[model samples]
Target chain A: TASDLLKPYDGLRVLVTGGASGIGLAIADAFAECGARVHVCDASQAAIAALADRPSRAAIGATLADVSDRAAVERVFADVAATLGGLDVLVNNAGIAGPTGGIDEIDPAQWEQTVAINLNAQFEFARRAVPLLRESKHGGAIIALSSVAGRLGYAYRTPYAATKWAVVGLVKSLAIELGPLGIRVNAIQPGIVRGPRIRRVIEARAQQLGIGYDEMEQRYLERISLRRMTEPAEIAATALFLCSPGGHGITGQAISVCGNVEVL
Target chain B: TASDLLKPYDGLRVLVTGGASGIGLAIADAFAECGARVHVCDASQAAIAALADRPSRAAIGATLADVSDRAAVERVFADVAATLGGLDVLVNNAGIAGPTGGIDEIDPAQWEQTVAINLNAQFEFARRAVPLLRESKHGGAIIALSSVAGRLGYAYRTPYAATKWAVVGLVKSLAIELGPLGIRVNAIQPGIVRGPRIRRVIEARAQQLGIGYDEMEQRYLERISLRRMTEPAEIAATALFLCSPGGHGITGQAISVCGNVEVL
Candidate 1:
């Protein structure tokens, strides 16, 4: 039922990373599409700024900061607390694909970049936000955007898997360390999703595998137990509750967004 | 019913680590009494070898090697693989409590030793055994010993908890990496047990808390959903089937032996 919605964030301040586009944008839209003061931060300034002019004037504000940089993350978070009225929901969604190659051929730079952005930066953001989060009268949540590849190691994504695993490890540590403080932390492992941006991946895989685009999609679909890819909004809805009041008892759980792709 | 037991384990070559005492010995005895060709290893050579003298007439042998020592582990395993004909179920039951203290006061040396013996060495053994495990005509299983401390943290035992967490992490990684190879790896997280060895801990807790032994037992018992501790034999029984063919679909999961304390 829609009654599952957690509305403690109706007037709360929320910070979302990578909120300019793709999965992050969908989540930002969900919060605003719901009733919350949403702040979206991405490296792409103009892309995030445009969300304010959408169908309705969502409390969505835009800022530019590369989450991987400690100084930038600190500055942007301070800006969010000051301008956005202190943060209650921290969605550490900013990430990059890093370089693509097999384990043997992958560059060290690429591996480091993947870990620094998709994994370690989350620690930086959350560690900085913990104080204000504890002070929120309505309580607070930390939402991490992980991938199915974290649990299932994808070929050509060794670093990506390592980082995802690190995120999970951090979640567990935070859950235990912060349990007495009433702060909740959880992760989302979204499966393959098809969005406007993801459409190009089909053609890319087709080119790499020397197969037609339809065959690539078919092969990927068949491996899934659900026989269907997920939608971006489905993942967004789950994240909303994870960072909202509905998920009070849930913490340190990395739930799959993949349609039944082996959820235990 | 016990009739559901997997008889395919008959005539299989299996290795049980820390097989000289307590839970390890129970598991070793159970498997040997059930018909597998059980080879054993332990830090104590005399005790492990003595298990072979029982009425079961099991052809058990022992080698002295700390599980934390990679070279020692490899040497013993090579001997076991050669002598036993082949290795099937590599039951990682060897682990140590080492030292217990709050995170701030934990000795770094003890922390390293705990991780070495309880975590990294488990991975080293698995890395070397994958080839032999995959060579079996039938698929194989690897069962590692985990504990409730793997999931729940104790106030004064950060090192122990961290190592347990590492084991869970390693199990999750191996499950995903080796699933396609027909090797299923899982871990058992045990809680309180009413064995001779466990009684010492119960007594220690009573002494520390300035309570009577029976009173301490009653207090602890009251906390479990089952309101009682698990028996070593039952843990051994669960271990046997997890490696047996019947448990093919169960991998990358940690099952708890603790009663209600595992409610979360």
Candidate 2:
């Protein structure tokens, strides 16, 4: 029975952040495919429109809001009540490839923005979701999206790295705080997932380090012991597994779905 | 400025349990190489004899003691005081590859033994070592050796996995308890390390699953994203980094030196 526990429970109400595109969208879609009623919020109107355009039989609710904005976050949860009734899972999947530069060279404005979106928003969402999570009959879970940077000392990308680290701290604290309520809090630290976001990151790092885009990308692959990029779907699978029965046993852990990015 | 942080401060006192052989020997040797005054405690008489016969330029003090035995642990710390003066770092490195079997099939006796050596001994040593750690000039650090199973749910290896998870929980608690005093507590999770210990583990796991020795190993390698066993030296290098200046910022974290084991 323990061996057969990876898929999530049917008809589970799940809320995903930045789920209109990239890794978040992949998680939202995967959960929907697995019989979960998914409601997602994204900052981008166009990305929300793409989800709007999809004519799938299992339609998902979409809310357009910047996660860092408290008013927007309030509205997002408001829509969740109308759309899914109550939440069983919260995936804090929104993050930015913040400016890659030396600590001295980084802009102060960029640092705060990265913190607001990457760290504060995660806390905001988790606090809001905890009450609903407590009401769930099948046990509730929060899957926070961190990165390999959360585990290692990443050079140049201080803001994103710091925010990622802070998220893990928050997850651990919440896990202990909510464990008695049967609410699970765990973080997923992904390696360099193959996508448009990573390409942009490579470009920024390339410019930061005075190298070609391909060269920077290659350098990243070289550091990862697997010598390749991770798939977004793999991250989604990890989230699904975490929300599942046997997988639900794990809490207060930051599981890295990295291809062993040995350094950052 | 940050480049000069890997090597530790000269003459810093260190204590490592089970440090006379295997990965423990490697860590003791490496820390000694970096100018830390070292003292070790081990359960094996033959392993102590090997360390005894060595004609190293820097002699390390050794105590023959079983980590799980309270009297032996008392004597180990007694020798620690008599030998290394006072401790700045405590490496809780002694661990057993506990029983590998289904929950129903496992011997109940083995479970308690596993918890004693793998979990309780760590707490015993930490409680004894913490007072001395508080008095050191350099920030004191504890490097608890956990396993990848601590983060992931290991199916067959229940006892080992449970203890490893408990060790991380202990480490996190100590981190918070000691942080105000500038002491660091961290756990290092190594995966499928290339050692005699791993071979024995593979043997037990295979026997449990009714698979051949080499066949089970192939399955493990396939699951690891990096497709290789971690090195003892790599595990040693991680411990070294944790005690370093830049690395001292980490606490309440389990750093997996595993080559990204995708599953267990």
Candidate 3:
């Protein structure tokens, strides 16, 4: 059933920012598995090399760039457009966890850094990708990687939450402006995703609170109705659904792949 | 500062459906407190009587009718417009806590009943209110009362979740379509609001599952990041903000006032 749903993605041109590792990599891999032409940009050279080693090397393009840097972002998007011939989907996945502290305790620089990558970079990518996407014979889709923080008031994660909320706003505005042009825009709000990223965030927070990892993890899981963390692959599946033909009617939506997070 | 921000609502003509009690009443009460001409309709004669007893009776209009009845809805809107002269804001707050059961176990009649009241009624209200709202020289705001069920899957609450999700879709679609007319549409997603309604829901669900009420309540609270239920007044505050001048730029958004619920 899933394979049939993804038939339209065969040879589709996709560009995912920060796709060298973690959730971005999973998204890129999913599209590549479907025979789509996938291009990824990451700040890590090691990650780019790993992406290069994938079995679908011919269909996958890798670029090394710090998305937060405007010049680097410009160069990478150009390379992607040139390599893929055109763009069908643009996944705004480049983001950082930002500092974990109360608003008063957070460094202003750190807050700006988070916004630069999480929100500004998305604007940059979308601006550059729109022309190429407009050239597509079929309607294009833009998927932004937001988090539960975008929907809820995430204490101590002020910068992340603010940027995520802005991402949702950006999606809504673009959806209305671009709907008439056949380009759909949406956002994915993921919850406590299971990964090295979340593991470290939890471990560090547990140490800060002088609590055992087990207790901390248990407390975290308690907030989720399904009592579990979401897998990266599961988030990828949601992204694919939004990009597929079946998602034609979905726009200006922030679909959650979380196992029903009760709170942030 | 908050009072200054709400000045735009002074003497504004507002309509709230099913507003005799609970959150609807709270929303109507808030506008009445702000010196707005408020009109409310409820199926319960007792609620209408109670509303009539309020000190602000001169500022509030009450009518009796079933919101799901299309003919009755038309009558209520006409009565509201005649009383208020014009409408500046509409609070589509009438809704029901539909039967709780697995999809297969839910009666077909119950499902249809829930859809009629929850989804169809909202459409009826919006369809009628849009023209009046467009007539407003200062633009207009339409705020729909949606539940957290709209954002997350609520097992055993199939009909409720389905209709709530549809309400969200309607809000989004209307927001985009109406934006050019200087009309804004949004939804408020509240979670486990503390009221007799939720108390009854918990009692019934606990009895069904053969669990103690305290344990069931604990399970519910644990899903919220704030570890508590929302007050009706809190939901009203959010509604007020959305209808105020401060929220002029916000549209096609679902603002959650659910104490940061982690999951549904």
Candidate 4:
């Protein structure tokens, strides 16, 4: 039941932050596959080169830029605008799973760095992308890559939860402010995604709790009713729909692609 | 942009809790309009009688039952199954506004009552309806009536917020448990519905804030991105869409009928 609604994505100019790997890469590729001109910014040169080396990577413009750095984000936005002639979508996907520990025990630097990458970078990118998006023929979209932690309180991942919660608030406020301009803003809350990142998270959490990785992973899956991890492409499908015409009525929403996460 | 996925309500067996008035009545009426065999339970004898006396009430079977009473819930379920033959859908729509006061000042009994009516009763009803719903050929759907408070932290209504959040958790967990049984469970979070119920709440809020009713109402509406109150019918429309074939793929979601509420 694929609708032609996505056919309008052809020639759409899109930018995805943290697009070199994982969920970000999937989003960048999804849009590119839909015939949109996609520009991806990643902090990793290895990831950027890896993407560039792909035979089907012609549709994607990969750049090495740390989203946490304001100057780098500014330059990347300018480059994207110049390259695409305009910008239609902004995917705020770059985020770090902050240190996992009790609030009192969490290092101040780790907390600050987590906020810088997850929350502040989102604000910076959206601030720069708005004007460019406003000029597009179809009012653009801003899709924040949030987590299930945004909706539910995570006992140990306080910093990540705080930032993700802030993201939901940001999306809501922006959607209202930009509604008259025909721009839509939303967030996607993904549960434990099937990737190396989650495996690392489980390992860290296991170490902190003095448990086996298998047991920790089981505990994590217990929160998800589906009792399984979500694919990165599943998150990308949601992003693509939100960016496409099919999601025209959807705005100021936090749609979860989680396998029905009961808690976190 | 609307899809034609809700066309198969003919002869569908549906039950709604507290359907004598307000949102419950609307939901019951919606399914009945779609040619479903609708049964409604209400705690108020007068409400039940009023519904029974309606000229066009033949399509609906009205019964009196206090949802918070476990024995009463059991009797109602038995009555519904006997009347409707089988329940294809269960709408847990009975809920209270709960006491509006600070957590410290709120009476313990009031808090417990709110939890019993809103959270515990939902569990009671769903527990009984599962077996009946599982027998449905087209797969059953359980729609929980949650509120915007479920997603946001509602100040002065801590008990209400707590119960609503619990309802969301219940829906997610049940969706996972019942997905294999072909039963889809979801929740709807409605903002300030335009009704006498909201008006009374607003008057009290205005008095508390030492502000004019109009100003207080404006402040409330300002939280909504659409900057207006939602009609009960609008919520019914969303419920209808979710319970129908149109929402076949949807499960374990708490969709907001709110006009994009920025905050509680």
Candidate 5:
């Protein structure tokens, strides 16, 4: 009974934006491991090429394009139909951390750039995905990637935080708006996830402090109640759980898999 | 993190139809156990009185109601507003088993009675509850009680099966219609639950077969994948889970707590 409820939906057709690398890639890989058909879009060429070059698993079908480009989103869906035939899950995982500066110092152009990829793209994807999701026998789902920044203020990350919070509002509204059509919408607010991105962040902070990366990492962990960095797989697991039988009764909820981030 | 997901929602105002006794009562009790304010309406005066007579736990407010009566339905809400102030959850657990006979032999009057209570009552309750549910700050929910019969045909139980099937259609439609409003709707399909009604059914079957109740129960158990009748508490647990944060992502799905009934 425990296993049955936690297991992923069988053979779901999934699409994850910016999925060729990072957290998006982890989510796609996790779904694929559970027998789901997955297709992803990413802005990175080297990353998409790596997926194609991998010798072990068959290449994961992917489209190379920036998420902010509206036409690029259409191409992603076209490849989705050709590869998976239909979609049951859409992961709006593409995002930019945005510029780090005081509100006065922040460039307005980058603010718009961050909003386009983080918020606008998520809305555009769900808009197109709704019709196809309606056709899903298992119902359909949209999992938007928000950050802890959405739930809490991030100093010098105002643009990113603002868009992240906006994503939550969009998810909350859509859960009710599309609920009649059997589509579930939720935002996954990850806190300081464990991966290359965090490594880069920790390294930069280490350089700034003239200290080792390990020292700066500990400083960050203290902000979390669990004193640990969440694994990308943990986020993937939450996604898998949402698509499973046990998680089917849930809607209009924002589940933060942040291990309780106390502050920014 | 583990505790946050499974805990009951804080201070939900819940209303259940036919909740003075049996499955409905168990649901009301479970919600109350979770610190929710609950009110119920039942057809039986004696059962309703017993709730008022309880000394240790505060009486759960109730109204004597024939679920099929539209006037009686309004009175329940009147009691609901006076008792709990407002409602967050509506458990449409009221129903009659309906007539069990060949379609040719079945009385038209009883068939109409069955549909009135089993199908029409659910629709009437939801129609009235939606406006109130739309106002809930936590987002609203409707947990309709369908049956395993809805999923698989039950021989000689044509009226019951038909209405149960109709309930599924109502839930499926409402989940979409209400999705945009942050009101979740779902059906819980219970299979051969352990309760008074089930015991009598086993007794009657045992007598028909010229055997003991124990033998008849074993035959029924064999039909379930888990080889057991579902507990009433199990049904309550599922209801609680639906209203909890862990289950918020789920909507428009019928969760069967029937231990996998292989057949009707």
Candidate 6:
């Protein structure tokens, strides 16, 4: 049976930053693969070039603009509006897990870097894109990527976790601010998605704890209600729908994408 | 039968600001009236003064400092530690629904004031009180005040709603940040509490809509699942449990005091 609620994003222009790899790429692929015009930007030249010939209206605008740079973010949005005709959806997907450090071990410089890229950057993007979005006939939507770390604190990633949690705050508050303008804003907090980065981290934690990687993964699985890492594409699918017509009533919501992380 | 699992706050020293009025008074009354040494602070000089003669070791203190002033917040904490003698519970109840207007029409000065008192002051109190909280033998619990406006946006109160929502974010993020310190942080999101300020607003809304105030209140009640404005005391009772030994295991949670706003 077709869900009548999710058909809104048909033929809409969508933009995703860092759409060349990982979760970003997954989100872009989901939108375009499901039949929406999508433009992806990332700092990686090679990744953009490779994605240029990819199927769907998915093309690589290989601009190396760090999202934290307000000017760079503004220019990218301008380029996207010019190329795509108008903007309907914005997925703020570019982020990083800052270098691992305990509170006593973390340098102030590292903290700055984490907050700028993960938290401050989205503010810049929204500031530049909001006007263009409000001008659109189709309702505008925004999705900020967060992490399960935002919901439950992981001991080692203080700064990184802080930024992700702050993103939740930013998205919800922005949703309230922009709701009357017909722009819905929300956030996605995915728990340890089964990806190369996460797998590596699991392996390292297993080694540190003197246990096999499989055992560590099992322990991780045990804590979640569904007991598994979410597929990036599933998270992307949810994102696409939020920007689609079906999600008109949903705004200022922060959803868990990790299959439930032993939630509080 | 009461649940045996809920009792983390058996022996604790606590302070609830604005404890002589409305929700604060209710919460303080719950903690002390039910048997816990509680210190109540409020700007209402007469209210605290009246409670001074009550000889239950439930001390009353008066401070005329604006909680938004960093120094004033610092001074309040120092007094709590000195007067209460080792602090464990902090219920940040001093908040307001500032002037209402369209986003453009709202006073920037009042908006800033709302942010300072509603949002930043909580942060200020937490900043100074965290160390003492962490050092406590039983750990500490903090509750920041939030409202339904924090969850669902309303018209003509953008600034007021924004700050309320900010408290939600601050509490969630702080929950994770302070979790490792053995301090649990949470926020309460209440629907329209029938306080003097809200009563006035409801009356105004009723007049504007050409409806009887009684009918307006009834209609408002019908919107909720339980169909009633939650009494301030019921919210305080919940707040009391959150700060007690029973809530020790729960952290980073935002439980709604809004009698089932909507089931998602």
How does residue B90 of candidate 4 score in lDDT? 91
User: Taking the tens digit of each residue's C-alpha lDDT, what string does model 1 give over A1-264?
Assistant: 356456445776778888888889888888877777887778886786677656665667777888877677777876787787787888888887654443334565675576567755675677677777887776677888877865664544445654565556556656665667777878888887877644665665466558898897787787678988989898888977765556667986888889865531
TM-score-best of 3 and 4: 4
lDDT, model 1: 0.71
iRMSD of prediction 6: 5.4
lDDT tens digits, residue span A87-176, model 3:
999999989999887789889999999999999999999999988887766678889999988988987789999999999999877876
> Per-residue lDDT for B117-236 in model 5, tens only?
999999899988999999988788999999988878987778999999999888867876776677877788888888898887778657756789898898888776445567676677
Clashes of 6: 9
- Please give the lDDT score at residue B115 for candidate 6: 57
Candidate 1 vs 3: which has more TM-score: 1
TM-score of each: 0.62, 0.55, 0.54, 0.64, 0.53, 0.66
The DockQ for candidate 3, computed on C-alphas, is 0.02
Residue B47 error for model 1, in Å?
9.3
Q: Give the Cα-based TM-score of candidate 3 against the true structure.
A: 0.54
lDDT (10s digit) by residue, model 6, range B126-171 = 6567667887777688887787766665555555665565566557
Where model 1 places Cα greater than 4 Å from the true spot, the runs are A1-87, A92-132, A146-180, A195-216, A222-228, A231-237, A241-256, A259-264, B1-12, B17-22, B29-85, B94-123, B147-186, B194-220, B242-264
lDDT of 4 by residue, A78-168 (tens): 7886798788999999999999999999999999999999999998999888888877776688899999899899988899999999999
Best by TM-score: 6
Q: Kindly report the TM-score of the first chain in candidate 4.
A: 0.96
What value does the lDDT take at residue B70 in candidate 2?
97
Candidate DockQ scores, in order: 0.07, 0.02, 0.02, 0.11, 0.02, 0.10
TM-score of 6: 0.66
Per-residue accuracy of model 5 over A151-255 as CA lDDT, tens digit each:
788776789999999998998688767765778777888888888888887786577567898898988887664455677766776677667765654445455
In what order do the candidates fall by TM-score, top score first? 6, 4, 1, 2, 3, 5
